[PDB]
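Predict the structure of Glutaredoxin-1.
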Amino acid sequence: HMVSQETIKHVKDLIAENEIFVASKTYCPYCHAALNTLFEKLKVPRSKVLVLQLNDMKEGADIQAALYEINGQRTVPNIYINGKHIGGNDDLQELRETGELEELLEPILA
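Done. Here is the predicted structure for Glutaredoxin-1.
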């Protein structure tokens, strides 16, 4: 219970309001891997995805701490698709490999 309810609600809002939400950082190899998969490989429209660079926001550490409380993950990339917690790049690639990611992205690509 490290973070304010204000921050928890704000992060929950970002998760709910955006088709895809990706918590990221600048110069983050695995963040780059996940975004390259989404935008370049799978051609998800960039305008449908909210990407935040935590290290460059005042509220950055606060947002990261909120995500830890919400989903138990402490690292970036931290991905949500259609309100559902995906995880990091490992998780995204695993869903891709089974064919699940295709079905998760379908309603969004429409």
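Strands lie at 20-24, 49-53, 78-81, 84-87.
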